[PDB]
Each structure stands twice: as C-alpha cells, then as structure tokens.
Design a protein around this ligand. Structure first.
Ligand code: ATP
Ligand code: PT1
Ligand code: PT1
Ligand code: AMP
Ligand code: CA
Ligand code: CA
Ligand code: MG
Ligand code: MG
Ligand code: MG
Lengths: 548, 571
C-alpha cells in the first residue's frame, strides 16, 4: 500500500540546513524550489537563522526532470488540511507502522545518548504534500540532496504520526520505483548513478525527528511558523518549549541564547542580519529623461544608497493626474538604460557586488511583470500591501527565483487618504494589518524572510498619528522594517523665502528621523537626500564603534 | 561680653539660603549672596541651586558700609577651611556648648513638635561656605536676621559654625544688645523700624541646625560642597548620609528622590533645569564673518544682521569672538580683538534697544556669550552690559584675574571653562593623555574648585571637553563616547564643523555638506545624552533636528504603550 494509487494530501514540516554562509540563500532557496516542484505546496516558512551551537546549481535547474504532480499558483485564503494539522484533528491512519509515546521516547533517547562524542543556516517550511508517507518523502528528499551534487533536509513532522522504524533496507529498484511515482525520471542527465548513493543513506526513520525538541535552531524556526502546535510526543506547545529553552539557558549557563542565533532577512540574494544595519533606500521619482534619471541612479549609488526605489506613479497627497505618460513608459526605459550602463563591466569586475538592489514602487501588475520578465528589479514596493491586485503575489516566484516585497499600510487613495483617519488602536491596528498581510503571502509560499513591513507614514494618518507610529516603532522589533518619512508634511508640523526655508527645515528634520531610526535599529529608510542621510549614519556608527 | 570684645578672628560657617518665589529665585538668592559677601565675610564654597518639593534694584544702592574691608583678591587655598574639613584644633566656643546626647534630644523635640503644627509650592535652595569675621553663631544669626529684614521672601539658616555643638533654649535680647552687635560689624546711623521686628525672631539657636539631617534638600546641597565632612553630632560623612537617604527612599517607599529635587544652572538670570533641554549656541566669529570674502574691513552691520538671523533661526545664546582659535590660516592684521567685537556688540545693543516694535520681544532676548581669554576685552563688555557669559577656552588659565570680573556689587556672570593644551599651531601634536576621559574631567573639576573657592557660584560654571583642541580625531570621538561622565554638570560642547566629523566619513562643497550633516548627527546624539548647550554654526539645521526629536519624545499617555498592547492581545 506504499505505492497506493490512492493520492492523498498530507502536512509535513521540514528543516533545511546549510553550512556555507556565502551561498546559504541560493542553496536553501534551491532546496525550496525543489520542494515546491517535487513534494507539494509550501504554505509556511520561518525566518532564516545563523546559528552557532559554486554555480552548477544554476544549470542543475535547467536539467531538472519534470514532476508527475501538478503545480497550481492560484491564491488561496485558507488551507483545511493545515487547519486540521495545527488543531490535531482527525486524519487517515499512517501507512507506516506507528510506535507509542513510551517507545518513541526510549528509541529517541537512545539515539541522542549514543550520539555523544562552524556556522549553520537554518530554515523550516510547512508543505501540503501529495507524498503518501514520510519514508517516500525521505526518498525524494535524498534525491533532491544528491541532485545538489551541502544541504541537510530533515522531516520534522508528518501529520500527527509517531514513527521509529529501526532498520531500513530499501532495494535499489524500490528506490527507483518510489521516485518514478512522483517524478518523470528520464528513463541529472542520468538518474542511474544517483540511486546507488541513496541506497545506504536511509538507515532508520524517526517522526518526529530525533532532535526536534533538543536543537535550539529547530525550535527557533518552528516558533515563527507554528507556535501553538502540540504533537503527542511533546510536553508542551512549540512556544512553551521555545520559551522554556530560552529562559532555562540563562539559568544553566547565564547565556541569553538570542545572541548566538541571529534572525535573517533577504533583500536580493545575500544574508542581512535583522536589526544590524540601517540601510538607505534612495528615491527615484521619475517625473525626467532616461539618461538624466540614470545619472541620478549613479549619483545615488556613490552617495551610499544600498537600494534604489524607482516609481513613476505619484502616491503623495492630492498630487495631480496627467494623462500624458504611462507608468510603464516612465519607469521601464529608465531601468533598461540603468541595466545597460551597469553591464559595461570592462570597469572593475570586482565592483559588481557594488550593484544596488533595485526596488520598484508599484501596485500595477503589468509594470511588475515586465520588470521581472526582463530582470530589471529585485524588490516589489507595493504600497497597497498587495491588496490592490493580489495576482501580483504570483510574480514574486519564478521556477528558480524569489523576489522580496515591502508591504505598506494605507487606506484609500491620494484624494481620500487624509480623510480616512479613524483608528480604534492606531499602533496595533496597523501592526495587526501587516501581520494579516504577511500571513497571506506566507500561506501562498512567499518566504517569511523576504517580506518587509512599512507603517506608511503620511498615508491615512494625521501628523500626530505619524509621530505616534514613530514613537511606537519598537512594536516592529521582531520584523524587517522599512519606513519613508522623507519630505512628508508631518516633519514640518514639528517645527516652531517661506517655501525655501520650509524645504530645508524639512530635510533637516528628516535627518533627526534618520538618527532616531538608527537607534531604533530600523532596517531600511526611504530617503531623497542620500548624501545627507549617509553622513548622519556614518557619524552615529563611528560614535558607536567603541574599540579602544 | 567676650562676644563684643573686638578679638578679631576668622570663623568657618556654612549657610543655607532658601526662597519660594520661583520667578525671582536667582535674584533673591544672589542678592543674599551679595549681602553675605559684604556684611559677613568671604564666600569660599557654594552648592548648585535646587528646586525642591518638601525695590531690590534700588535697595542695593542705599546700603550701610561694613566695618570690615572687602578683598576681591584671588586665593589658592584657605587654611581655616582646610582645618574645618578635617576637624583640626580651633578656639573653644564662646557660647556654651551642649553635648551630643543633650543636643540630639532637643533637635528630636523640635522635629516632633513641628510635625503636628503642620499636621493641622516649590522651594529654591542653595548652601554656601563663608570665611567669617563674626565671632560666634548668635552674632552671625543677628546679622543674618538684619540681612533678611533688609530684603523685606528669603530664609537664611546657619548649618554649621566650626565644630561647635550649641543648643540655646530661650532667647530674648534687649533691642540694645542687638544695636551693639550690629554696630560691631556694620556702620550704623531708618535702622530702628528694622530692629524691632528682630527682637522676637530669635526664639533659640541650634548648631548644627536642627533640620541638617532630616531635610533631603539640605544634604543634597551639602553633598556638592563638603561630601567628606563629619561633624561630632553626625553618624557618618555628609556623602554617606546623602547616599543612604537616596537609597532608603528607594528601598522603603519606592521613590526616586531626585525626580522632584532638580539641580539648577544659570545662564543669565533665569532658572535652567540641568539636563532638561539642549540649547543652541549660535556662533558669530567676526574675524571669520569679515575676512572670508578675502576682504580687509569689519562690517558690523552685516555681523549684527547675522545675530538677528540666528535669533530667528532659534539660537538661545549667541557666542561672539574676534580671535580665531581654530587650527587653520590666520588673516589677523592690525585690527585688534577689542576692535572686532566691541563695535559689533554695541550696535547689537543699540539695534535691540531701538526695537521699533512694542517690547513683545523683551523676554525673548538672547543671552550673549563672549569667546575671549582677554581681561581687557571682557571688562569693557561687562562694564557696558554688552555680554552675559564669559566663554574662556583656556578655562581662565591665561589670566585668572578674569575671574574677578564674573562678580560685581550686584551682578554675577556665568562662565564656560574649556580644556585644551597649547595653541592653534601647537595643539594637534599635544595629544598624549594618561587617561584621556578622566584627565580632562579632573582638569575641569580642578578649575571649578578654584572658581568656587573664589566665590563664583557653582551653578554658574559650565564645562566643555574642548573637541579638537589637542585631541586626535579618535580622541574627539572617545570624549563623545564618554560624555556620560558629565551627567552631574552643566555641559557645553563645540563639535560644529571640526575636522573630526569628516574623518568619520568614508565637488568639494560635498565635504562641507557631509560635515554639516555629520554634525546634525552629533546634535542628535547630544540631544539623547542631554547635553545642555551645543555651539553651532548652522542654527536653522540644528533647530529642526532638535524640534523633531523633542516631538518624537513628547508622549501624551506614558503607559499608553503597554495599555494599547494589552488592548490588542484581548482583541
Ligand atoms: N542654626 C540656625 N539658623 C537659623 N535660625 C536658627 C538656628 N537655630 C535656631 N534658629 C532660630 O530658631 C527658629 C527655628 O529655626 P528655623 O530655621 O526652623 O526657623 P524658620 O525657618 O524661621 O521657621 P519656619 O520656616 O519653620 O517657619 C528660627 O526662629 C530661628 O531664628
Ligand atoms: N514603501 C513606501 N513607503 C512610503 O512611505 C512611501 N511614500 C511614498 C510617498 N508618498 C507620500 C505620502 C504622504 C506624503 C505627505 O504626507 O506629505 C508624502 C508622500 C511613496 N512610496 C512609498 N513607499
Ligand atoms: N567653548 C568653546 N568650545 C569650543 O569647542 C570652541 N571651538 C572654537 C573653534 N576652534 C576649533 C578647534 C578645533 C577645530 C578642528 O579640529 O577642526 C576647529 C575649530 C572656538 N571656540 C570654542 N569655544
Ligand atoms: N525524520 C528524519 N528525517 C531525516 N532523516 C532521518 C529521519 N529519521 C531518521 N533519519 C535518518 O537519520 C540518519 C542521519 O540523519 P539525521 O538523523 O537527520 O542526522 C539518516 O540515515 C537519515 O535517513
Ligand atoms: Ca507545488
Ligand atoms: Ca567680603
Ligand atoms: Mg545527520
Ligand atoms: Mg539530517
Ligand atoms: Mg529658617
């Protein structure tokens, strides 16, 4: 009943590990892609963590064998099997032989004790899987591992099952037989010489995985995705287990474990440590001739911007509608000239890790599709938090690429914004709103660690409400936070040729908010005045660097 | 009486000066200082001013002279005072001394008897050490009472008088005995309508004063001046009693006793609460303002315009100077410092006075500070009421006599003391410190002690670490990293446009801009460290930054944070 024709939908929790800091993202993201291709749908992910307890991949992705199972990108609002899995409601009897608590505890404990005798990059995922059983799932997992010619993908959970199968002998053609049930094996190029590897790689099978409740890096991840979840073989919920291990660490060793184990977010393709640097995002409001616009982009890189945010649709208050030129026509050419002039890499080839991350400020599906088709951008800055056209969420995943996104809170539009100002609980309403939005992308397979939050200063907030959101920015301490205060009316509201005076004050007032952001450890600030902001951040950094 | 026997002596007495008139605290209290300086002896120590929670302008003209002479002369040490601090041998008290127990019982009695009468507003407080020619406390109390009367408001208590231990239960004096004691010290001559109020006033005499150990405000002040002093009557040094009080209020009533017991500094004539506001001090360097054209003439009209621009831009203080003290290129010719600053300051005084407008701006007038080390320049400014503050980058080392101009018959001026070594050509190589942070701090505390010994009020003295003066770039940073060591003191700093900001960075007006912006970073940092005064060129930019940071800090409900949080978790 192992290769039962009775196709099912099960819930599996995986753990993905690599050891290589420089390639972690590509490595783990490659694994993510091969999970979505080969196992089912990703419907949850944790953050990426650095824990302390080359490029054949690019052309692996070309030469993949087709799955025998379909991919479906339609947005879902809800997933019933997941609700069921979280709740410990009823599912179909395991096809693999279970063990009771007592035996699991012993046979688990046994494996730990017996095991008694660098950097690690961790990530968990929930998969709604069409694979029948954990052992099969492992087979496929071992395929994926061997494909990536470096990666350790463990099965943390698989429904409410408890399984300790003690010795596993799998015939060389059963392994082929299993894979074929789920993959259009080309019978890399040749699957023959992969099988013989996997022959010995499955010794036993423990569900839950042995270390689930014993490795910090595991509980850290699971705490992100499924904090209220209580498996049968656990004293308490993930949260409690997580909390207990954190506070307990302070007693046994006075350790404060968060310090070793750093949360990560990703803007393009490298690690960023949450709360460890205030990146500048320079604004390019194209509203300006391509060549000119591109000079500005170059000015900005050199003035110290990590990110350029280009937009051709003005989202500021009461701004004028003018039918003359389309958002596409403004932004796409500019990005194309940029990518051209950058690619003239006769200049130092080492200065291509100088390349700015490119962000496009749009809600328009058509604009983003062209940008992504033509590799012109890295990030979607969607000021509707992807609510205006959620189809846009499907553009954040390619076969072998993930894009990051900024989710901003607003109400209404440029004309109505200033009216839509009532909030029962301003700070938490908005936070809860961004959490609801993040949950939505995450259910739809956007990596949690590629999603950035923005409270949308000046968008359906009075000026006191904008200040109040800054005063309470601490509520974002756990999240990658992106803000834009630059040149907004609320700065000027704070102050004791009239219009030139006011401009300067407003720019200088923004540098105060650069200072505040720096101390609040805001991850990105969206600014017009890049040289000024960089000067501020450089000085505050020196004042912090306390080495002799 | 041995009391009136003209056996002329020097005694050490420690006084308390208290008022409750908020708006005039400075005036009331400094006037009292003046009368104590004239009629009692020499002021050789002062505390800070503190806000605690439990016709004068004319009167100064018509004051009877003193039978004792006043020396404005500077001293380096004061042996009597040294002797008072260690409790070395001093002449027996002419008044009868009680013993510890007896003393202790009578105070306890006064403390309890007073509880009930009250068991049936803010204060402004200041202590002072006086080296006195009065022979005993009762005489001093008599003169003190005269001073009070003369002022019509004020409460001047004696807290110590050498090592003596006195309690004198019942006191009436003939209006005759009074006139005699008064006549001993003051040239008397109406005085009579004064003398009659005084008869009943002196119910008793307690030395040390009854409340010395019970009122936080008194220990608070004394801890500024004589931390290490132990009286026979006291269980421990003033420092220890002070710390124990703070700590007991914390442990036992869960109160932070400091929170409504605020240290004050004075820039001109108004109360400033230490650490409550970062004031902008706008720079007017006439030398620069005038010879950067490449020109050769002083333009005083242009200079005064700049002063008005700065006032509108939000400067609270204007620092004017003629000598260039920066490291760079000197275009100083025949035209003197005096000629650079005094004309400008005089046109400013005229222009401010010929305010065509109604005197709406009367209370919005900037404090004027002069960046000089020069006795003559300062004297001219002070004699013609052109300046308020001496800004002395030598910490009064170039000419200590300049300290005597901070004081007048009825005026006190505030002073900035700054640390440097050498001069503009020399200073960049004068960079070896055994302990950078503490050497500079100790230096300034020694200058403060010197000025305080010479009766400059403690709360009028401001410290400046002197960024970029005999400091490498990394040392300038290190002084900012360690600015907390100034948490007890009025702190004035000067980072504006100095080389060390640029070195923090990675056409050529790019540097200028990077520098001005990098400075706004330090305004930010100064804001959070609660620096009292920052000396800046770019007033408008600095004011924007402070305005916005002040706004972000102004919260409506201080518990809203955790409340709204809870509201949200309850859904
Ligand atoms: N050391 C002292 N200094 C000043 N006055 C003293 C002292 N010892 C006794 N007295 C006198 O005894 C009385 C009590 O001293 P205290 O300073 O408490 O009085 P007070 O401040 O005038 O009274 P209150 O402020 O409680 O109305 C005063 O009338 C004062 O003349
Ligand atoms: N993610 C993100 N975050 C922003 O803050 C933002 N702001 C604008 C500019 N929009 C505004 C809004 C309000 C105001 C005013 O009150 O002045 C001005 C400009 C454009 N894209 C943005 N994208
Ligand atoms: N009280 C006070 N505090 C200062 O800091 C100050 N600075 C100057 C200007 N002097 C300098 C010194 C160093 C530097 C450089 O390294 O660039 C520049 C200018 C003039 N008066 C001053 N007065
Ligand atoms: N749930 C599981 N997930 C992955 N490997 C497992 C699991 N249970 C047992 N193993 C086996 O344990 C061995 C070492 O991997 P690990 O236990 O993940 O360190 C391999 O032979 C795995 O096949
Ligand atoms: Ca899939
Ligand atoms: Ca005198
Ligand atoms: Mg292993
Ligand atoms: Mg493993
Ligand atoms: Mg009194």
């Amino acid at each position: 009943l192992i290769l039962s024709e009775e196709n099912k939908t099960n819930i599996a929790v995986l753990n993905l590990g690599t050891n290589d800091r420089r390639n972690a993202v590509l490595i783990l993201e490659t694994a993510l892609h091969l999970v979505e291709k080969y196992l089912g749908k990703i419907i949850n992910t944790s953050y990426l963590y650095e824990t302390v307890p080359v490029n054949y991949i690019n052309e692996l992705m070309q030469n993949l064998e087709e799955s025998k199972y379909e991919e479906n990108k339609e947005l879902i609002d809800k997933c019933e099997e997941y609700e069921t899995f979280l709740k410990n409601g009823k599912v179909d009897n395991s096809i693999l032989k279970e063990v009771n608590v007592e035996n699991y505890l012993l046979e688990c404990n046994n494996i730990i004790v017996k095991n008694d005798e660098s950097y690690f990059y961790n990530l968990t995922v929930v998969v709604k899987t069409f694979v029948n059983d954990p052992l099969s799932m492992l087979v496929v997992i071992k395929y994926i591992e061997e494909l990536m010619k470096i990666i350790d993908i463990d099965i943390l959970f698989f429904n409410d099952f408890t399984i300790f199968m003690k010795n596993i002998k799998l015939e060389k053609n059963m392994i082929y037989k299993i894979l074929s049930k789920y993959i259009h094996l080309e019978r890399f190029r040749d699957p023959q010489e992969i099988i013989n590897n996997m022959v010995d790689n499955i010794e036993f099978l423990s569900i839950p995985h042995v270390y689930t409740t014993h490795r910090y890096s595991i509980l850290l991840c699971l705490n992100d995705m499924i904090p209220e979840y209580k498996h049968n073989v656990l004293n308490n919920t993930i949260r409690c287990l997580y909390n207990k291990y954190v506070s307990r660490m302070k007693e046994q060793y006075n350790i404060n474990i968060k310090e070793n184990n750093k949360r990560i977010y990703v803007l393009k393709d490298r690690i960023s440590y949450l709360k460890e640097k205030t990146n500048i995002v320079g604004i390019l409001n194209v509203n300006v001739e391509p060549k000119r616009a591109v000079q500005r982009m170059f000015e900005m890189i050199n003035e110290g911007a990590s990110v350029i945010d280009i937009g051709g649709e003005s989202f500021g208050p009461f701004v004028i509608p003018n039918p003359k030129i389309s958002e596409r026509d403004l932004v796409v050419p500019v990005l194309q000239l940029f990518q051209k002039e950058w690619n003239d890499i006769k200049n130092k080839i080492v200065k291509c890790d100088a390349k700015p991350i490119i962000s496009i400020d749009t809600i328009n599906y058509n604009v983003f599709k062209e940008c992504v088709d033509n590799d012109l951008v890295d990030i979607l800055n969607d000021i509707s938090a992807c609510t205006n056209n959620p189809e846009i969420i499907k553009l954040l995943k390619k076969k072998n690429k993930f894009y990051s996104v900024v989710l901003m809170h607003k109400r209404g539009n440029p004309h109505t914004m200033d009216k839509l100002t009532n909030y029962d609980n301003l700070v938490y309403d908005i936070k809860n709103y961004l959490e609801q939005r993040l949950n939505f992308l995450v259910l739809n397979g956007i990596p949690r660690y590629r999603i950035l939050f923005d409270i949308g200063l000046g968008f359906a907030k009075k000026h006191d409400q904008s200040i109040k959101l800054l005063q309470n920015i601490h509520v974002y301490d756990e999240y990658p936070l992106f803000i834009g205060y630059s040149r907004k009316r609320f700065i000027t509201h704070c102050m004791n040729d009239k219009d030139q005076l006011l401009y300067q004050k407003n720019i200088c007032g923004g540098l105060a908010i650069a200072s505040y952001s720096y101390y609040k450890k805001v991850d990105l600030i969206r600014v017009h005045d890049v040289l000024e902001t960089k000067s501020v951040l450089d000085v505050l950094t020196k004042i912090d660097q306390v080495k002799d």
